[PDB]
């Protein structure tokens, strides 16, 4: 019969067998890491599937621990009486295909007894969706009430709705576009270059070598983190202030740092301790090939042809997925009644920070379901 | 007698002696590279000083040629009948202190016969103004009719106007802010890190070693280039198209590149062949140190106290020095009657591309200097 759902901090590892990718290549022996909160209803029709973003994982809520290097990335969104109210809904989240937090990816051991590494194939967002759908099938779940996500999570949710409109009752698509843009591919390809030019990248087969491309991954994360924040907030929070230490300001003209510089350095250092460079490359490449129109006659035809009820949200200060992209989605999707604009200074990261606004968008989506 | 001004493509190398910087550090034996166009008046009062931006040089107009690895970066702005009309004005431009196109910088040889390299002291925008003023004095010039610049050049022009209001009759401050911002220091410090973490940076003393931090400088330039362009521009020009070469389209599902990726790579590759990594770091740190308010009671006090008439311009699509920064400049400077908005898809780089718009701003400025 079906595999049982885990609960809470517990990760279930769901084998889905060999999978055929959009490219026609095959990945053998794929395992999908899954977490869940709330009881699955008898008819298995109350699932809210949460698609995590580029550097997040299946741990949507909960504490950090030996199984969870980071705490929940959407704290308070899932729980009793929360937006995803676990008294009524069953929240489910996977780690994306190509990830490094339990699902098969570059750090995983392959059949030949060596890390996947450079042998891990290129994947698309559609491959990621179909791996999640396959995992749900192994859990006995053949439809979802809603699929929700922001950023790369929004790309997954959008493709899911377009690919499986008869198996989704509603979707939340937050802070993403219908396809990768020139600016996105520009910065993302530069981040990949920072990793791959690091001497310890070793062609991507550094796993188990004792060395890793930490300097390159650190730089890649710093590049990305700026794209995730708002321009004004960076100037009001940091401006050109020096870093303030316990007993006073540093001197940026000597050995000291600017406050924004110290902030970015700390973000980069923490990230390298928590994330795999090869996964970062695979997942960033999947974002570069995000395109809901591919094989479907273009973006307009694909979106106009999707009947799923959809809440589309965008953020005023988002510099990576600017509001014009969500205006396009909201216009073209016939199941979207109009763009929801999140007013926030926090840039793209507002979808993680603006608790009340995001809760309202999630509640609206589940009401549609 | 005062040193003679050069003309046209000719570079003059003006010694100004040893200089003490704002930090207290010293640079021995500073030499400033200078170019000039047009005749200096008998009163020596018709100089229009052009401040170049981060990766530009003294060669404001003219072709690439035997002595100029790049052609003029503001072609058509200087000449007979042009916006800087050499029938009336004497245009002068230096290579900035810390640069790598003729003026003393980290590639220059120090008194021990090795490049300054890691010994080159960090400079501020104010140091760069003081060095240009010192070079002008060696050329017999103690005042300028106008000082003009965009981007880093705008920071130099703004500081010059605030520092020497008695010796400037007008300024053009284009596509810059009153101080470095959080986002600017963020991206600039990351560009510096790309260079300094390169395995061949060697603390900045890579010269003559057989290894150089070209890969890191290439990455730094790609990061910067994105900040210089417009978001919509990049999506309309490249979108997610694959690169097309002589033999057809590349395939990003395998080893091929996207068109925007190939564009950035090519920009980086060309750049590393004609710019020095240590100079890039020094000049980028000078931008981190830009702050017209320092030692003057803050930005608002410094700007409100500047009596120079100023044309402030900003670009609608600029992502590095967004329009809100020029709105602040235009509001606080009493010599600005209102922001001039340049409509362009090209982002920050519009100040180099939008010739008609920039020509108009330069003409407006020089009319205020008369
Ligand atoms: K619609
Ligand atoms: K004013």
Numbering used by the authors:
A (entry chain B): 10 to 378
B (entry chain A): 10 to 379
Paper's wording?
The three solved MetX structures include residues 15–70, 77–372 from MhMetX, 10–379 from MaMetX, and 7–372 from MtMetX. The catalytic domain comprises residues 15–181, 297–372 of MhMetX, residues 17–183, 304–379 of MaMetX and residues 17–181, 311–372 of MtMetX. For MtHTA and MhHTA, Ser157, Asp320, and His350 comprise the active site; MaHTA’s triad is comprised of Ser160, Asp327, His357. MtMetX and MsHTA both contain a small helical region (αL1′); MaHTA features a unique pair of short anti-parallel sheets (β1′, β2′). Temperature factors of the equivalent rings in MhMetX is B = 19 Å2, while both MtMetX and MaMetX are B = 21 Å2, values very similar to the HiHTA structure with B = 16 Å2. MaMetX shows a similar pattern with the top clusters appearing nearly overtop those of MtMetX with S = 26, S = 13 and S = 10. M. abscessus MetX was initially chosen for study due to its high similarity to the Mtb variant. However, the structure and CS data argue that it might make an excellent secondary target for drug development. Many compounds that inhibit MtMetX are also likely to affect MaMetX. M. abscessus is an emerging public-health threat, primarily implicated in pulmonary infections.
